[model samples]
Target: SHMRVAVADVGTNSSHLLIAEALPGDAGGFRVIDTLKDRTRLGECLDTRGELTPEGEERLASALTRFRELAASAGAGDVRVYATSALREAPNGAEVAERVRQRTGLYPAVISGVREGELTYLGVREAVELGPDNVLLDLGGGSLEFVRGAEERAADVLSLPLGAIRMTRAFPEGDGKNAGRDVADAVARQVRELLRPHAGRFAARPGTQFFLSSGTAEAAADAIAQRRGGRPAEAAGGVNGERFTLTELADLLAHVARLRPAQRARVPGLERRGDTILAALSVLHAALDALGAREVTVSEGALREGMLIEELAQVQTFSLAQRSVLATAGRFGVNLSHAGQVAELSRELFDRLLAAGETFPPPARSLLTAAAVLHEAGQIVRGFGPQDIELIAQIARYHRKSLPKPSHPDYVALAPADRALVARLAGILRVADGLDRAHTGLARVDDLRRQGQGWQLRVSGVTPLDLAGVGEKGDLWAREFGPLSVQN
Candidate 1:
């Protein structure tokens, strides 16, 4: 059966939706049916006191109403709503959530700062490639999630309260008659404190990259590209197809700060919302300074896409879960030498499985690769009996199945099918992991070939290992492929 899910992210500044159809297969993943975005600025009133003003509530309700209609039209099977720092700190946040729930029949799930990082990470995991230690900065209207990790390892993520809407509201006036040096100073101070704990980590890794996600970064990149006389304002479109340097961005920031609203708006790449440029730039620059990042990259993906990709992956493949699990593990400094070896072995097995019989499609093969790479990530949370397995299982289950809540930064940035595939392949990966219980180079494949009704997996090695474990793992492979048997 086909399932359709609609996700609405009521952010500090915008509300966006992705409506898609979930198809049956390996990991039930969705195909993008439709997408819409609106500038709501729900955190426009967030102050040092951390309360949503009356104006913020009004704009939020209006945006929710519009999103509700779109959800209904899409025949949504499930609705997930998220509120960030604006609502979290709002004194009457519960009331607003209740009111929105009553009006739209959608329960708003308020996520913590860390979860925000995970959600944004989910959406953009596939869009950007992180090395062993990379920093991801997602600045929404209300808050930011700063994540640092490797491609498939532990991630030390921090969620900051400094966002475009909040910063701008607190420092509306800029240099000249309405200068915002006061606001900029406060932001800088806050950033300094936030960076203090992570200083050692940053210092250890030189040339640490900062990847900027959300409207502010995209807007700045667009403006800079246009200012440099690039045609068609391609950078504004979000995906990083072209190139721009940190020096260029710094130059643009300087120019933008000097320009008035009208002048900034007239700048080729600058959006109509040019007035907010200075505040966003201020927050971004502060982060760059605090992290000592030489440059930054722009991303179009974030929390919303992460949510949807995770949701659909539940029943299919192409999920970003496994990749994220590995990335988060690497970020937290988990060793992956053994995991990488196992992943290589699993890929070899999968390739042979495919060559014997083209059971899974090309996309399925891609998912298998990611899942194999992250198959052992769960081992990082050691000490608890079965806890590691349970954690690994949960991570694998969510890896490609469905969209994560806004709180899961890793799940925030993936595309639908990619997310599902991650989950499905993770499942297959766990079984392969079980075969390596001893971590010895005992299990080997020899004379492995296809037969009439089923494929045969023959083993020859230095010593015989657990037959039951090998058989069990083989069954999983067969289930993903076709009927097959393992022998020693």
Candidate 2:
């Protein structure tokens, strides 16, 4: 019965609350204590006015009041409330936040829709094998977020906005049979335009995977698993679970879509949310068509779970971020030989520092490792020009670090601190990239010791230093981890 934090994500269709105890372990992993969910369909009026109706607001207020009681009962250290797509687009989002806060003393952060998608990606990434080069799609009540691109070690994350409630409102008349085609066509057009620039990057990579999160996809996964005579996946267990081919999910979607609400509920795997399967399918179809992705998989976890895991894990170190950077580099076809060497050397320095009473925690170590692994992924997009800074930043955001941006498919899964830590880890990764400027495995650090509130890195190598990238790396690293101790 230690202290815990409670996270509530008040989405357009449902409100979910997760409570977890703080524990010392991997920053990217957390243990769950309890979870509560209520389906309010707060987006029922989103199609008409871009605002919650009185009824919708009332429903949300009631849910929040109940959630607040649960949070207090759970003895939560703090309670965070986040509202997504529906609230984000609502003209009166601030007012809604005000009302909820006034009523329950709980002020919700109305995040950008793109960020909602990114959080979903973070949650899924922590819970599953959400590797680099995979397309991440999350369908929520009011809109969808599509995160697709090469999984470079550097962050190259991008997003497109569409969603379940929004799609249903946009194409209200279609039943199960025609809804898929209509939504797919519309979503495909939008996705095609958004992803046009990154086409070659994702297409060139092999072993690409698709990660689906949120209520719709989870219900679908449950349905498919049960139909196939397997146990339904549990959200809290952190299992990778079963992966469904696009064709298989499509068939299931169609089957569920054709059934009425009662019939759908009768199905072994139907989530109460299954009523919205057709809408979710619309978003999914659009994404698959746009990316030409052949297969898709589902995760039981999404945003709230990610947030809970972050708090419980107390992830202050940077190791998970480092692994991501390395993974991204490998997937993008970077020179792994040199990357591995750089990672080894950088980690060697990091480990020695930690053993000698360095303040860098496991979370920081994870970030450093990620930076070491992915510091050089920017080479792939170097041909693009001065604008490559933005590209590199995104690559860092997506492929390199542990903290994912809200636009990334995984962001929703993490708490605010975890997301911020991810950004910090990415900065460290950029430094690691700098040390490998020559790509010759020549950068070496020796006599590494913490000196006067800062660590010193003395470098010796056969090749002349690439001062340009190295200087930039130092600046970036200082901005993240403090001034670097680099000598060559």
Candidate 3:
């Protein structure tokens, strides 16, 4: 259950290392134990001859040495070092890798652009469930990758030489005097021209969902979310699953384009990314326009995480949502016995409801199952209270004796359809949880059949069943499926 692994992503702009403890499950569940980042900017100092400058090579080697030390300190048995963009294109890239190998005893593999795109897509798939009509975008410092295809696999992977560092170096905005519509327009034009060759590949195909990864995309999403009054606490961790509209992106681009680097650096979420934010935005705008996308969601997992998953593939494989819920439950130390029973019962009810006439799709069952697994997370916290329970309930969308209220922050955060789905699923989960109120897993629904003016459930496994508890928890069932009764 505890397999410690480390992955070092040596990029053109920055280098990062992640150490995680792989959990026991098919869902690729893991907890990040440590993370390290260094701004090496290997691509910034590329000479005219396409060779890495002496200073850049030294910095990269030093970063790798430190990363190696950290991985060893974390007791990581397996370590993977991957270099992209800068090393792949630099004439002296192999020399730099040789230097790093000599200094740190680690081999840095320069992955191909196409292979990088595939790894990025795999990483995003690990974090966010992809649909049949999905588009994945990875914005890196040296290049950009676009992948489109069905769920869990990329059918078409395109890599462009357009990256934030590359664009920033190509077009430098000296100060606020040169930072305006003219510069922004020029950058956008260049990006559009580069994408024109592949125009037919990602043409205006309606109903395609867009998912993005990279520090640039996450920072952009964070900036937009903050501008819209989103809480900083909620946006603190990685911006995975965060949704931001393209219209808002355009607004952000317009607002930041007029400011100088110093001014842009002072902005709340764009502080760290102020230098290259404009270039990143230009590329994003061009991609959005080319694909005719309305919005983009962020995914935290990327190339490094993807590589980690592949390394651990023989360990286990599980669905994205399932992995997330299990990890969350593990973090909160939930009682697996009770949670497992509740999940089983909830799924049973969901299947019956769907068979009868529920209009929602199958994915709704995944949400319901997730909520059931995590329903008791709040109770594990020390000194837990009604507020904590309400918090967890809001997350699980299970409003014990009442319906979802708009005033709830978490409830209001969900999209309209998602809110409806969670509410419905939570309703069933509440009944299922109540059925196992004793935490003994003694209640069982043997069968369901039509009765006088309602439905009846043949229950067993519990002696002298608490009919009152069933009635109290069956409110959602009655609201959604008329009156209900249980018998043993």
Error of 2 at 301 (Å): 2.2
Residue-wise lDDT of candidate 2 within 211-271, one digit each (tens)? Answer: 7777777777777777787775563343255577777777776675566645667776665
Q: Kindly list the per-residue Cα lDDT of model 1 for residues 1-488, writing each as its tens digit.
A: 34466776777778777777755454545577788887776676555566666676667777767776776687663456666676776877777666666665654556567767776776666567666667777888767778776664327767776777666665566447435445555666766777678655543366565687887787777777667666545523554633456677667766766677667678766655576676777777777776677677777777777766654443133223255534444453322322443454566566776676655545454444443545445453222234334433443444323556656765444455544444445545654554443333234456457766667766543112234455555554555444666665
Off by over 4 Å in 2: 25-29, 148-159, 174-204, 231-240, 256-268, 309-488
TM-score leaderboard ranking: 3, 1, 2
State every prediction's TM-score relative to the real structure.
0.60, 0.57, 0.62
lDDT of 3 by residue, 1-488 (tens): 34477887888879888888777545565778998888988888799987999898789888888887888788773356778899889988877776666676665667678778887888898889788788888989999998887776678888888899888777877555656555677778887888888867765476788999988998888888889987652447657899999899999988888787678888768888888888888888878877788888899888887776664552233233255555566566564445666777787777776666668754666666666778867653223344333444454645544454567654435456655666677677877877665343445677776565667777664322224457777887777666887876
The lDDT per prediction is 0.60, 0.61, 0.74
Model 3, total clashes:
3
**Using lDDT as the measure, which candidate wins?**
3
Cα RMSD of predicted structure 1: 18.1
lDDT for residue 419 in candidate 2, whole number 0-100: 47
